[PDB]
Design a protein around this ligand. Sequence first.
Ligand SMILES: CCn1nc(C)cc1C(=O)Nc1nc2cc(C(N)=O)cc(OC)c2n1C/C=C/Cn1c(NC(=O)c2cc(C)nn2CC)nc2cc(C(N)=O)cc(OCCCN3CCOCC3)c21
Ligand SMILES: CC1(C)C(=O)N(Cc2c(F)cccc2Cl)c2cc(C(=O)NCc3c(F)cc(F)cc3F)ccc21
Lengths: 63, 311
Amino acid sequence: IRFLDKLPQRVYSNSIYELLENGQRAGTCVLEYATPLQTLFAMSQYSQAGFSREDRLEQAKLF
Amino acid sequence: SLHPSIPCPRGHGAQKAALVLLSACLVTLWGLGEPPEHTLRYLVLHLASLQLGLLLNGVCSLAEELRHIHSRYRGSYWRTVRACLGCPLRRGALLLLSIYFYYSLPNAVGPPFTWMLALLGLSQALNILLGLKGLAPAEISAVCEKGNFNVAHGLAWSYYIGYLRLILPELQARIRTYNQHYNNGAVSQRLYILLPLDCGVPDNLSMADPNIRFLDKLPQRVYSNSIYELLENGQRAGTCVLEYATPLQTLFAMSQYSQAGFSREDRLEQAKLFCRTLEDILADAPESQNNCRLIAYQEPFSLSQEVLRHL
Ligand SMILES: CCn1nc(C)cc1C(=O)Nc1nc2cc(C(N)=O)cc(OC)c2n1C/C=C/Cn1c(NC(=O)c2cc(C)nn2CC)nc2cc(C(N)=O)cc(OCCCN3CCOCC3)c21
Ligand SMILES: CC1(C)C(=O)N(Cc2c(F)cccc2Cl)c2cc(C(=O)NCc3c(F)cc(F)cc3F)ccc21
């Protein structure tokens, strides 16, 4: 998965990524992560959450 | 040398022609072999008459320039005399030479002193009233350009001082930042200024030629510069920051109105002169460190091909 180009355009920048299959680009797509999962992880890191790793995985699946 | 139609700065052809004429006249005089002292007398008398006529014309000009002294010559008569008759001491010496030569050298073909003065005054009055001593447009343009008395020079310098010098130092950094943001192609780092000799500046650049198409607003008082990519046989081959020359648009608007006294041929002359003046300024300016180029053209053809060949 390698970055190719910032998709042209309230200002959303979606980096597109090409997919190397044995070194050859089988295609490309607009690919991105899910930020609520990152917020769940950061919730689990902090101590003012009461939100453990077991609960973090449970909430990730439920989300 | 931007365009085949842009005039070159005036050469020394007039002085070359004068030297050719002087050589021919010397050949003729040596062939005829007339008494040289008579020739000296005649030439000195002719120059004296011409100088005194110029003195009379300057006096006539001073007669009206005396009323502008408070607002144009800071209320000093010496400034008015200098502006109406050139350098005072040089012309006074020439006039004294004329008077002494005429009063010493007899005039074989010429009036006495009072008769010559009266005839010269009459001729000066006739030339003033009838406009016989008329200024040819070629010499008018030569003098205006030599002394920088053209609207195009002022417009070009205003365009430089107000806009170009402010944005060129940071245009390189802005283009580098944009190219780092949008990668893959890349955008040329040099500004491109359009210069249609016909002064046709459409609001939309793509309307003039579909091959040139807007790409993105370049990131940044507030300078909104639009970048354009050029279509070659349906596919883009290059891209650059391309904007129109607003002073040419102002020149066209000046030509549109009926109070500027600014005709279409005058608009063509000032367009060419603006192109040349901006060429010189951006050639010697420090801010134009190979940073700006002018696409000067005229439709009698595609602009995009010319911009590509520039790229
Ligand atoms: C001066 C150089 N020059 N000589 C000739 C001939 C043509 C130009 C030229 O092209 N100049 C120019 N073009 C710009 C384009 C952009 C952009 N965003 O793309 C940004 C710029 O800088 C802000 C631009 N500048 C410089 C500043 C320009 C205009 N302006 C002036 N008038 C002059 O300076 C002036 C002096 C003489 C003589 N003639 N003129 C103008 C005809 N007073 C201003 C006061 C304010 C304020 N603080 O309130 C804001 C200003 O600018 C906002 C206008 C932006 N409009 C401009 C037109 O198009 C659309 C965007 C002011
Ligand atoms: C170059 C050459 C040979 C020449 O072609 N002329 C024209 C000309 C005349 F004008 C007059 C007669 C014969 C010729 Cl031939 C000329 C004139 C003088 C001269 O002293 N002119 C006095 C003078 C005027 F005559 C009229 C005037 F309004 C003011 C003035 F001061 C000297 C040399 C020449």
